[PDB]
Design a protein around this ligand. Structure first.
Ligand SMILES: Nc1ncnc2c1ncn2[C@@H]1OC(COP(=O)(O)OP(=O)(O)O)=C(OP(=O)(O)OP(=O)(O)O)C1=O
Ligand SMILES: [Mg+2]
Ligand SMILES: [Zn+2]
Ligand SMILES: [Zn+2]
Lengths: 99, 1163, 73, 89, 50, 121
């Protein structure tokens, strides 16, 4: 199996795999430690931002790849952005501070 | 400078209570109807749980009514339906709210184990609930009458107490009461009460609970939160697309369970709002209020009441709280990733070390966006739309383009259980035909990859950084040493070490015996021409090099006494190595130390290109060898049946003694097992005597015997495959088996695999096999749960400071276990940096001066002299607050130099410990957990508490007291000792504090307390290492020592003058503040403390960042207990920075956080 | 706890009505509503406004359904 | 230089700051800012930046010196234009 | 979009009300067709090949 | 025939948190893909069809752009009825219809079309 860019799930903007290019590889907690044990800070960020949950960066990436600029403009994963609204839709006020 | 308003780069995250005013800021309308969609048109009913007025348009830039469909109209609200025309995405962002009729208690603050609403009031839960369901009144600011504030009344009592005091006395019931209680409550005033009460009454039962409550209370005032806010007046609703109502095929619908939960709250709230305008009897509205309370509770956290079930379906409904979990460690289970793939992996021995075979097809799909760009960048495609149609057509030219994008572009490879950092390594891709992934055979050892069906996954480093990160950090050839023990993880495995062992071998009389050859080149010429045999004693002129000069290769040429094979192998050995390194027999043992020395002498590159040539030549000559395995290769000794009958005789006599009552049944079973155990040892080293040497050959004369050249012997002697324990099961008899309950069966398996086993033997062989598969299956689980507990206590630990600057360090010796040296000194001390100058057997003479990194030269300069002990700086002593100085840590890495700033030694320590965890066996892997968890043993020994002469006091009262009496100081120490446990202290001897008063195991908690931090850290490492060193597992003490640093992360204060008296806290925070007190502030009001040993999971429980804690701990309690404190998470750490999707505060990201933490708290 | 119990328990204290007590309450209900009706009838603005609203019914500014539903007989 | 990075880490001691400096240089070439400082054996901008470290002619200090130089070259071109923003007076 | 409509007026293609949803052979696999079955809901007229 | 339409909506919607029965305890909702989304392999070409038509429109006479970008929605709010474009340009109506036709005509010859045509498939 392989997959560059494919389909994505509605609730969690994460790679789901139906028709055409299949589902992506799961990159679990233990694989994350590997990158942490290396210095792979960027390899990790792009692995859990632009390459998966970042609904905006993922296409700012695909456009930048074909443009010939190997940059990522990150942004925030949807998993955490949903957790804002999930915590916030309990009685809990959770904010992002400073500047 | 201007402040700011909008959106820049956020740092930190604050959590708090939400005022009802706060909750309405998020809402863009009140949901008023339980309606969802319309039912014929699947449009959203306005003022419903799904709505376009409140949340957003259904499709992009289209008003709901339709009068404003054009993308021109944007910030416009249609005059009919209160809908602005933006993206459908805002149905994923915009929240709503509901105005509650009656106040409603927040289940989390009412019911999370320590009731916040409870102890904020100092009110019990069975009382608050009794007030909440309208069963009994509670007083509120009862004033100067007959009743206290928190007093609780019944119906009749409230009536009797009302007739006496009409006003000037207030009592309510229901949520309005508890809301008033928290509202009227004054925190600062109650603070002044708890402070005077602490000082007036001296009692350990009084001021032990007193201090425990007040720390939350004044944390609550300082929090900014308001106590009224735990009673909900407004309930915010989650955006709809996060609980959507999408259609499926066949026209059937699916929706999140919240909609059943949200619908019910609305219905009961609306019904209650009706029951008030109908002015219903209180009996009804009370029941309605109770249901609204129940409905909200099942929405926020279903499960803490009677657990409502979903519509028509038996399963319960997944509440908001369960949206967050979904039990433990539920936000960090993993995320699927773009630009990835997997397939079955196969060999490919032709590969250089830094590359891997990638299928033509996988590499096509994986780099698709690179190909699309590189295609029209050169102009082979007009535009991207045709570029797709090209690589869809697989035109011949896209293949030649794919090589262009592929060249300097590494890929990542990952195998299933990712144990240590080597489980993901970056290789340079080689375009290969077929659907298999080709894996370099030397990197197999790191991955634990067989080729029996195992698969690996691939990942594309997209950004420029990740490509350089993959190239400089994760590359195959940049990690050739294990980070668990500075030895090479890229050892020749099996097929290859058989080859070299076959080369570097010699037989007594072979073709070429005795000729003299000008150089190694003519030695290969002699073999490939069929003139000289690969193994024949032969003198050859060789030149070797040695860099004994100041960095320069001195050459030396001689006629060395070797063989033809070892001559040809010398053509591979690079430059400054001695010819002695190949002059021997070269088994897997000697073949890896050959590789190690090349790295420590010549450096990285010449080692990488070496390992390749060792594999190429190893494979080739192993294939030339024709080594096989036939049935006649497993030689059974001729004396086997003899040994069996002899032990078969002894047992018949031990039985003879048992019949006559000479020996016991327990002795018989024990004595019979011993003669069978001996017989197996006898057959064993009988077949190995025959097998190993019986090759009797002849050179010019009569006879002469040597190590055998039989196939299966060479496999073991070399170390390629096979082990003497396993071989013994083929020729000799195979052991005694264990019957299920744990006994070992008194008649062993006399037969072996070269013969047959019979029904009975095989049937008994079964239990060992099945419990083998189960034990090895379970101990693969226990390990994985260990490395979790281990990274959870570490993770955030990073080499931060350069040199903390200390002379503190642990005294390093060889372990010398009873008999002789179970571990040399040179191993324990290599790669560490010395605490102070080490001296010769005589002094005035520094041999290594102060903090120098003891490497191989220094270790020999140590091993030349008779130095038997070296004080070494250790992580447990590194005085860096928040992290570890590079010096005190050591050097180890997959690279050979001292640790670099920013590496996340916390993880790579934990990994190195739990990776070999599969291979262990009180003792075994739980014995490791017992130590790291600091678990006290069942029946401990007690240690001498204080120095002085000891004596016994009182008599037997269940406890026999012991009174120690120091020479100078106070003597009031008396310890209650159960005197039915045999003691060891001499009853008239002066005892030194920390000595054996009884015997048996000891608690680490004592060791730290009595003998000190340096003794407990020694006790752990030597005791866990005994588990690993028993199983033949090399783990440097370094890694165990960083875990220990986390175990004693905390301390308890003894004296005061600044903060509390007994609190437990980090030495990092404490030491940072009593160092702040030796100058500045007070002259020295500083406090003394006492280091506290925590088990890893207890030590991991204490994390500042609540986002980290909400990962693995119980997410409800962390979120509640943090939201009441108004706690700020500053990020800073590892776990949370992953959760929020930004650069790790380590590695390449360490430079980023260091540039960020400094701009913060500055201008 | 669980509201079913405490509702069941709360109303179980209420005693069933005798077949005569049903009339006692319906009589007290009669008095109260009739009492306010006698008080509504004493208010001049209540007379003028009912006349204000009927001068709205005869000018086709409403319907007879919007003001009354019937008289006695 | 493509087989291992050890020769480069010698010139900048961190192994981590090497990935950050060599990446910062790789952008200067890929996003067509600059031309190489060493002959390119087809090597991508990933490696060419790494060759420039082993050759010793590029590091974070040398880059910042050249950049702070370019701040003043483009400032002297825009010079006679931005002083014409004496309309704020 | 604007630009796509300009593309519709230049090369004059009657923009379809219909989307391509054909069953197509999965990528990579290849073989021979050896059977076709058609099950038509009762009431729909059995098509030609059916 | 309404029975079918009736029978469709009579089924209550399905718990999206239904366990689907895998070994990962996958829930139903984890499998419903986002069909409202534009795939990056498409949005990439949208950013390319942009630069395509912009280059092809600078190959026209200057007032052919302002008359074409006005007839379609390109780089302006809304599209303009060709009469509305006529009021902007003094000489009105039929005059504009030929400016419209001739601009598509200069772009239809295989020299300016070679780039644009490959957006049709
Ligand atoms: N990171 C990985 N490294 C090596 N092997 C992997 C990896 N991931 C999956 N596999 C193999 O792929 C399937 C399971 O995949 P998944 O767990 O269901 O997840 P996803 O559906 O998203 O692919 C198994 O292989 P097999 O089915 O052949 O059977 P096996 O487990 O006994 O080897 C796995 O070994
Ligand atoms: Mg295998
Ligand atoms: Zn509208
Ligand atoms: Zn230190």
């Amino acid at each position: 199996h392989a997959r560059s860019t494919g389909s994505y799930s509605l609730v969690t903007q994460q790679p789901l795999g139906g028709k055409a290019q299949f589902g992506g590889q799961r990159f679990g907690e233990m694989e994350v430690w590997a990158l942490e044990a290396y210095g792979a800070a960027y390899t990790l960020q792009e692995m859990l931002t632009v390459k998966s949950d970042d609904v905006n960066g993922r296409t700012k990436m695909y456009k930048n790849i074909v443009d010939g600029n190997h940059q990522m403009e990150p942004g925030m994963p949807e998993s955490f952005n949903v957790l804002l609204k999930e915590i916030r839709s309990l009685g809990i006020n959770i904010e992002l501070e400073d500047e | 400078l201007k402040a700011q308003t909008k959106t820049e780069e956020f740092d930190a995250i604050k959590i708090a209570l939400a005022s009802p005013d706060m909750i309405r800021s998020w809402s863009f309308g009140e949901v008023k109807k339980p309606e969802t969609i319309n039912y014929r048109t699947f449009k959203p009913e306005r003022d419903g749980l799904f709505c376009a007025r409140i949340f957003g348009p259904v499709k992009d830039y289209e008003c709901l009514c339709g009068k404003y469909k054009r993308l021109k109209h944007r910030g416009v609200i249609c005059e009919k339906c209160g809908v602005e025309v933006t993206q459908t995405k805002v149905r994923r962002e915009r929240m709503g709210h509901i105005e509650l009729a009656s106040p409603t208690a927040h289940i989390w603050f009412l019911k999370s184990l320590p009731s916040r609403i409870g102890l904020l009031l100092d009110m019990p839960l069975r009382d608050i609930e009794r007030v909440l369901y309208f069963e009994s009144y509670v007083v509120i600011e009862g004033g100067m009458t007959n009743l206290e504030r928190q007093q609780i009344l019944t119906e009749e009592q409230y009536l009797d107490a009302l007739e006496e005091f009409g006003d000037e006395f207030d009592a309510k019931m229901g949520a309005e009461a508890i809301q008033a209680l928290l509202k009227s409550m004054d925190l600062e005033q109650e603070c002044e009460q708890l402070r005077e009460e602490l000082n007036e009454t001296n009692s350990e039962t009084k001021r032990k609970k007193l201090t425990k409550r007040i720390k939350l209370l004044e944390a609550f005032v300082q929090s900014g939160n308001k106590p009224e806010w735990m009673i909900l007046t407004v309930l915010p609703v989650l955006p709809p697309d996060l609980r959507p109502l999408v259609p499926l095929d066949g026209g059937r619908f699916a929706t999140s369970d919240l909609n059943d939960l949200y619908r019910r709250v609305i219905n009961r709230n609306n019904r209650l709002k009706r029951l008030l305008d109908l002015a219903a009897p209180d009996i009804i509205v009370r029941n309605e209020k109770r249901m609204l309370q129940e409905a909200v509770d099942a929405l926020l956290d279903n499960g803490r009441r009677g657990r409502a079930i979903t519509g028509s379906n038996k399963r319960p409904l997944k509440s908001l709280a369960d949206m967050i979990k979904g039990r433990f460690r539920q936000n960090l289970l993993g995320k699927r990733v773009d630009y990835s793939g997997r397939s079955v992996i196969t060999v490919g021995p032709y590969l250089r070390l830094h590359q891997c075979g990638l299928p033509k097809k996988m590499a096509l799909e994986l780099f698709k966006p690179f190909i699309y760009g590189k295609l029209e960048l050169r102009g082979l495609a007009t535009t991207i739309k045709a570029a797709k149609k090209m690589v869809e057509r697989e035109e011949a030219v896209v293949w030649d383009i794919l090589d262009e994008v592929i060249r300097e572009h590494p890929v990542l490879l990952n195998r299933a259980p990712t144990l240590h950092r080597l489980g993901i390594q970056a290789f340079e891709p080689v375009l290969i035909e077929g659907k298999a992934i080709q894996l370099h055979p030397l990197v197999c050892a790191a991955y634990n990859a067989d080729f029996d069906g195992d698969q690996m996954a691939v990942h594309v480093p997209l950004t420029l950084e990740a490509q350089l990160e993959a190239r400089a950090l994760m590359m195959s050839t940049n990690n050739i040493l294990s980070p668990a023990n500075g030895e090479p993880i890229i050892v020749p495995s099996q097929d290859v070490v058989l080859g070299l062992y076959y080369m570097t071998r010699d037989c007594v009389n072979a073709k070429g015996e005795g000729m003299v050859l000008t150089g190694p080149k003519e030695a290969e010429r002699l073999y490939r021409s069929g003139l000289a045999s690969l193994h024949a004693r032969v003198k050859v002129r060789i030149t070797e090099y040695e860099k004994d000069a100041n960095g320069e290769l001195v050459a030396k040429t001689s006629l060395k006494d070797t063989t033809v094979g070892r001559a040809i192998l010398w053509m591979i050995v690079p430059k400054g190595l001695p010819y002695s390194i190949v002059n021997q027999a070269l088994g897997k043992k000697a073949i890896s130390k050959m590789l190690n020395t090349c790295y420590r002498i010549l450096g990285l590159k010449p080692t990488v290109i070496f390992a390749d040539q060792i594999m190429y030549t190893g494979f080739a000559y192993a294939a030339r060898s024709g080594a096989s395995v036939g049935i006649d290769d497993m030689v059974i000794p001729e004396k086997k049946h003899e040994i069996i009958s002899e032990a078969e005789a002894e047992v018949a006599e031990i039985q003879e003694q048992f019949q006559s009552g000479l020996v016991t049944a327990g002795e018989r079973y024990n004595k019979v097992i011993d003669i069978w155990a001996a017989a197996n040892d006898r057959v064993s080293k009988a077949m190995m005597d025959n097998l190993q040497t019986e090759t009797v050959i002849n050179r010019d004369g009569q006879e002469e015997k040597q190590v055998s050249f039989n196939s299966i012997y060479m496999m073991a002697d070399s170390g390629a495959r096979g082990s003497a324990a396993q071989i013994r099961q083929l020729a000799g008899m195979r052991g005694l088996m264990a019957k299920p309950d744990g006994s070992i069966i008194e008649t062993p398996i006399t037969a072996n695999f070269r013969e047959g086993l019979n029904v009975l033997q095989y049937f008994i062989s079964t239990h060992g096999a099945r419990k083998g598969l189960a034990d090895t299956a379970l101990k693969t689980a226990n390990s994985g749960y260990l490395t979790r507990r281990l990274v959870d206590v570490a993770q955030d630990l990073v080499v931060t400071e350069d040199d903390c600057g200390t002379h503190e360090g642990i005294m390093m010796t060889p372990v010398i276990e009873g008999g002789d040296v179970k571990e040399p000194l040179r191993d324990r001390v290599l790669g560490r940096v010395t605490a102070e100058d080490v001296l010769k057997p005589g002094t005035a003479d520094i041999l290594v001066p102060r903090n120098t990194l003891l490497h191989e030269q220094w270790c020999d300069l140590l091993e030349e002299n008779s130095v038997d002990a070296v004080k070494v700086r250790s992580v447990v002593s590194c005085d860096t607050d928040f992290g570890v100085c590079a010096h005190c840590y050591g050097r180890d890495l997959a690279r050979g130099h001292i640790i670099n700033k920013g590496e996340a030694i916390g993880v790579i320590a934990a990994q190195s410990i739990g990776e070999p965890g599969t291979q262990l066996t009180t003792g075994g892997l739980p014995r490791v957990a017992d130590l790291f968890e600091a678990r006290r043993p069942k029946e401990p020994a007690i240690l001498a508490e204080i120095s002085g002469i000891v004596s016994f006091g009182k008599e037997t009262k269940g406890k026999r007291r012991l009174v120690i009496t120091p020479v100078d100081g106070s003597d009031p120490y008396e310890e209650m000792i159960p005197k039915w446990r045999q003691l060891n202290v001499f009853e008239g001897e002066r005892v030194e504090r920390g000595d054996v008063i009884s015997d048996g195991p000891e608690a680490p908690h004592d060791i730290l307390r009595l003998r000190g931090v340096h003794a407990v850290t020694r006790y752990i490492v030597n005791e866990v290492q005994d588990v690993y060193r028993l199983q033949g597992v090399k783990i440097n003490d370094k890694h165990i020592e960083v875990i220990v640093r986390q175990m004693l992360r905390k301390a308890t204060i003894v004296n005061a003058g600044s903060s509390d008296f007994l609190e437990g806290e980090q030495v990092e925070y404490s030491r940072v503040k009593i160092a702040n007190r030796e100058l500045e502030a007070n002259g020295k009001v500083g406090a003394t403390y006492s280091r506290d040993l925590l088990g890893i999971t207890k030590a991991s429980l204490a994390t500042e960042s609540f986002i980290s804690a909400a990962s693995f701990q119980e997410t409800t309690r962390v979120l509640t207990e943090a939201a009441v404190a108004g706690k700020r998470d500053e990020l800073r750490g590892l776990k949370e920075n992953v959760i929020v999707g930004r650069l790790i505060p380590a590695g390449t990201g360490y430079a980023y956080h260091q540039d960020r933490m400094r701009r913060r708290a500055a201008g | 706890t669980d509201p079913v119990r405490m509702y069941m328990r709360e109303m179980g204290t209420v005693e069933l009505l005798t077949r005569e007590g049903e009339i006692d309450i319906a009589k007290r209900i009669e008095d109260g509503i009739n009492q306010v009706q006698c008080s509504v009838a004493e208010y001049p603005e209540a007379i003028t406004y009912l006349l204000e609203q009927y001068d709205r019914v005869e000018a086709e500014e409403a319907r007879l359904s919007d003001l009354i539903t019937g008289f006695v007989d | 230089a493509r087989v291992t990075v050890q020769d480069a880490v010698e010139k900048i001691g961190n192994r981590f700051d090497l990935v950050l400096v060599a990446a910062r240089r790789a952008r200067q070439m890929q996003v067509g800012g600059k031309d190489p400082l060493v002959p390119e054996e087809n090597d991508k901008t990933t490696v060419i930046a790494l060759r420039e470290i082993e050759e010793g002619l590029i590091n974070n200090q040398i880059l910042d010196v050249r950049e702070r130089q370019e701040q003043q070259e483009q400032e002297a071109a825009e010079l006679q234009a931005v002083t014409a923003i004496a309309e704020g007076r | 979009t604007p630009e796509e409509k300009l593309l519709r007026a230049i090369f004059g293609e009657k923009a379809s009300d219909v989307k391509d949803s054909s069953l197509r052979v999965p990528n990579g696999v290849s073989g021979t067709v050896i059977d076709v079955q058609v099950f038509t809901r009762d009431g729909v007229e059995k098509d030609k090949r059916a | 025939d309404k029975i079918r339409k009736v029978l469709k909506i009579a089924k209550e919607p399905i718990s999206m948190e239904t366990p689907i029965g895998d070994d990962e305890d996958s829930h139903l909702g984890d499998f419903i893909e986002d069909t409202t989304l534009e795939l990056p392999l498409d949005s990439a070409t949208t950013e390319s069809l942009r630069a395509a038509t912009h280059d092809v429109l600078a190959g026209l006479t200057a007032r052919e752009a302002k008359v074409l970008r006005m007839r379609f929605g390109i780089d302006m709010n809304t599209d303009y009825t060709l009469e509305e474009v006529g009021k902007q340009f003094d000489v009105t109506r039929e005059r504009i219809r030929q400016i419209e036709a001739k601009a598509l005509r200069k772009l239809r010859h295989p020299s300016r079309s070679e780039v644009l045509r490959s957006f049709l498939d």
